[PDB]
Amino acid sequence: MRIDELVPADPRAVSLYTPYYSQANRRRYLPYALSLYQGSSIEGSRAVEGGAPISFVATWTVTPLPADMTRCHLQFNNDAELTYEILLPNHEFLEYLIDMLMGYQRMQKTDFPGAFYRRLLGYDS
């Protein structure tokens, strides 16, 4: 229903992933983003400055090892011709999900970060 209404993951499981990432403000959103990660399916919106936000559908496969790579599937506007496949490490995928919670915290709206679409489009090659 809403990101602030998501229940956090257990501390025994979350504290195990903590030393594999930057130990700072990312620790705060780690329990909530790990819960979102375990969800494997989420609806999200991309915010465009000077435009209107676009609704996309995202699904992915999860694994317990942080060194494993996850394949995520994204569909924008529920169109089969706007299908995206993105594969990246679990360590890096959670940095995106944690950054999403930082955007959520500041504006109180569900918006995915621009850097996620930069890598989704492959602008960094």
Short mmCIF file of C-alpha atoms in Angstrom, two decimals:
data_model
loop_
_atom_site.label_atom_id
_atom_site.label_comp_id
_atom_site.label_asym_id
_atom_site.label_seq_id
_atom_site.Cartn_x
_atom_site.Cartn_y
_atom_site.Cartn_z
CA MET A 1 0.00 0.00 0.00
CA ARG A 2 2.72 2.50 0.97
CA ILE A 3 6.49 2.32 1.74
CA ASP A 4 6.08 3.68 5.34
CA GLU A 5 3.48 0.89 5.91
CA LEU A 6 6.05 -1.83 5.02
CA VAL A 7 7.10 -3.99 7.96
CA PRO A 8 10.88 -4.18 8.49
CA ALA A 9 12.94 -7.36 8.14
CA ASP A 10 14.25 -9.13 11.29
CA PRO A 11 17.50 -7.66 12.76
CA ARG A 12 19.33 -11.04 12.77
CA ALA A 13 18.89 -11.27 8.98
CA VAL A 14 19.43 -7.53 8.32
CA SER A 15 22.56 -7.17 10.56
CA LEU A 16 24.14 -9.99 8.52
CA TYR A 17 23.91 -7.92 5.27
CA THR A 18 24.97 -4.63 7.05
CA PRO A 19 28.84 -5.07 6.83
CA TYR A 20 28.65 -5.75 3.08
CA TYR A 21 27.53 -2.12 2.39
CA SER A 22 28.31 1.41 3.60
CA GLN A 23 27.55 1.60 7.33
CA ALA A 24 25.85 4.97 7.72
CA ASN A 25 22.36 6.24 6.69
CA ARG A 26 21.98 3.08 4.53
CA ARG A 27 21.69 1.09 7.82
CA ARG A 28 18.47 3.04 8.62
CA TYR A 29 16.64 1.94 5.42
CA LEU A 30 18.31 -1.52 5.25
CA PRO A 31 15.52 -3.34 7.25
CA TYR A 32 12.79 -1.71 5.15
CA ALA A 33 14.54 -2.14 1.75
CA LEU A 34 15.46 -5.78 2.59
CA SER A 35 11.69 -6.36 3.21
CA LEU A 36 10.94 -4.67 -0.20
CA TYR A 37 13.71 -6.85 -1.78
CA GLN A 38 12.08 -10.07 -0.40
CA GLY A 39 8.72 -8.85 -1.90
CA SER A 40 10.04 -9.67 -5.45
CA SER A 41 7.18 -7.62 -7.01
CA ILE A 42 6.46 -3.90 -6.64
CA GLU A 43 4.63 -1.08 -8.46
CA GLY A 44 6.65 2.14 -8.70
CA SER A 45 6.73 5.51 -10.42
CA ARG A 46 9.46 7.39 -12.24
CA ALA A 47 9.32 11.14 -11.53
CA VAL A 48 10.19 13.52 -14.38
CA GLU A 49 11.07 17.15 -13.57
CA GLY A 50 8.87 19.51 -15.63
CA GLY A 51 6.65 16.55 -16.56
CA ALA A 52 4.31 14.06 -14.93
CA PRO A 53 5.31 10.77 -13.24
CA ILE A 54 4.98 7.43 -15.09
CA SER A 55 3.71 4.18 -13.47
CA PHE A 56 5.79 1.04 -14.09
CA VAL A 57 5.56 -2.60 -12.89
CA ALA A 58 8.77 -4.30 -11.56
CA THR A 59 9.43 -7.98 -10.68
CA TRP A 60 12.66 -9.83 -9.79
CA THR A 61 14.19 -13.06 -8.38
CA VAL A 62 15.90 -12.96 -4.95
CA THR A 63 18.82 -14.97 -3.50
CA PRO A 64 20.34 -15.12 0.03
CA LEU A 65 23.97 -14.54 -1.03
CA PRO A 66 24.81 -10.80 -1.46
CA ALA A 67 27.52 -11.61 -4.03
CA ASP A 68 24.87 -13.17 -6.35
CA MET A 69 23.36 -11.24 -9.28
CA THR A 70 19.58 -10.68 -9.55
CA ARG A 71 17.64 -10.32 -12.83
CA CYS A 72 14.91 -7.69 -12.62
CA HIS A 73 12.14 -7.18 -15.16
CA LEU A 74 10.55 -3.75 -15.58
CA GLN A 75 7.49 -2.87 -17.68
CA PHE A 76 6.59 0.81 -18.15
CA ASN A 77 2.89 1.73 -18.70
CA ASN A 78 2.11 -2.07 -18.81
CA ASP A 79 3.37 -2.22 -22.43
CA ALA A 80 5.10 -5.39 -23.75
CA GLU A 81 7.25 -3.24 -26.12
CA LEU A 82 8.48 -1.21 -23.09
CA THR A 83 9.98 -4.28 -21.38
CA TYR A 84 13.37 -3.89 -19.70
CA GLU A 85 15.69 -6.59 -18.35
CA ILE A 86 18.36 -5.51 -15.91
CA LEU A 87 20.89 -7.77 -14.22
CA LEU A 88 23.25 -6.39 -11.58
CA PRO A 89 24.70 -7.58 -8.22
CA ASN A 90 22.55 -7.90 -5.06
CA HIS A 91 24.98 -5.47 -3.30
CA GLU A 92 24.35 -2.86 -6.02
CA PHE A 93 20.58 -3.60 -6.43
CA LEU A 94 19.96 -2.82 -2.72
CA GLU A 95 21.85 0.54 -3.09
CA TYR A 96 19.12 1.50 -5.64
CA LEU A 97 16.30 0.23 -3.34
CA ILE A 98 17.87 2.10 -0.35
CA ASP A 99 18.22 5.31 -2.50
CA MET A 100 14.47 4.88 -3.38
CA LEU A 101 13.68 4.96 0.38
CA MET A 102 15.81 8.15 0.72
CA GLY A 103 13.67 9.77 -2.08
CA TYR A 104 10.56 8.41 -0.31
CA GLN A 105 11.68 9.87 3.04
CA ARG A 106 12.33 13.37 1.65
CA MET A 107 9.14 13.83 -0.49
CA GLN A 108 6.80 11.22 1.17
CA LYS A 109 5.85 9.86 -2.29
CA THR A 110 6.89 6.60 -4.02
CA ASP A 111 9.40 7.69 -6.66
CA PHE A 112 12.28 5.65 -8.10
CA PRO A 113 15.66 7.40 -8.49
CA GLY A 114 16.87 8.77 -11.87
CA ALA A 115 20.18 6.86 -11.55
CA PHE A 116 18.19 3.57 -11.73
CA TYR A 117 16.76 4.52 -15.17
CA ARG A 118 20.27 5.70 -16.26
CA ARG A 119 21.56 2.13 -15.83
CA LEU A 120 18.23 0.62 -17.03
CA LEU A 121 18.59 2.50 -20.36
CA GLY A 122 22.37 1.82 -20.33
CA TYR A 123 23.46 5.48 -20.64
CA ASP A 124 26.69 4.60 -18.81
CA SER A 125 27.30 1.85 -21.45
#
